[PDB]
Amino acid sequence: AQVGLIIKVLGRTGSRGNVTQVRVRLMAEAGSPDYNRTIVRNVKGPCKENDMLSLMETEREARRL
């Protein structure tokens, strides 16, 4: 369960607008291959910039808009 930091909020994406799409940067060691790796994912619940997430899988990008 890696931890990612939200660095940009793209906008509400659901039809009812209850899901937000964000761009997160993976927090990893300096020598780790996941250094500064960035992903776009979908988030449920109130969130803003500088929040942190617990990614159960880090090999899946979300479809934009």
Binding site: G14, V19, K44, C47, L53, S54
Partner: protein, 182 residues
């Protein structure tokens, strides 16, 4: 002559921290004497994250038509609950409560086909409190065991990750369904 507050004049706040890094900024450990404060915590969007965690727990007990508005009663129930938790675990009750909140809610959820999504830190804290108070309320409905014992059992099991907890059972099922729709 000024001294740091202790909850119910018994439990110390120093050294209180959560081991879940993601929830580090959404669980407040500010010292207080009693879980009662007439603040405007719903004025702004994320302002409620700064309310002390024990008062958040107290607000979760005033739910049905019998309990709405009975905040002084909720404080009395919490006073006995912390004592029972201390006897069961032989450690600081505040630390045990913080642990239960840190791992009482799922991290992956499924929303409308159905898609698997992640959960923001604010919702993780909100859901853990909601589920634990819900499990104890139904366990004590028509039962010899009183409410403080039911609440103490739910919190101690949740802090250890045991499946006997109502919140833990619901957490595992939700995460399992989300991975199915991954």
């Amino acid at each position: 002559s000024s001294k740091t507050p202790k909850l119910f004049n018994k439990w110390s706040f120093e050294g209180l921290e959560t081991s879940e890094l993601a929830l580090r900024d959404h669980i407040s450990t500010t010292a207080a004497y009693v879980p009662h404060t007439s603040g405007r915590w719903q004025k702004r969007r994320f302002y409620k994250a700064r309310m002390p965690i024990v008062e958040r727990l107290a607000n979760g007990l005033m739910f049905k038509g019998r309990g709405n508005g009975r905040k002084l009663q909720a404080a009395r129930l919490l006073k006995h609950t912390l004592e029972i938790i201390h006897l069961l675990t032989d450690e600081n009750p505040l630390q045990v409560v913080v642990d239960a909140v840190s791992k009482g809610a799922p991290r992956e959820d499924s929303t409308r086909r159905r898609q698997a999504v992640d959960v923001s830190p604010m919702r993780r804290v909100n859901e853990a409190i909601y589920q634990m108070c819900k499990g104890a309320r139904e366990a004590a409905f028509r039962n010899l065991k009183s409410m403080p014992e039911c609440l103490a059992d739910e919190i101690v099991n949740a802090s250890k990750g045991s499946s006997n907890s109502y919140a833990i059972k619901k957490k595992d099922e939700v995460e399992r369904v989300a991975k199915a729709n991954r």
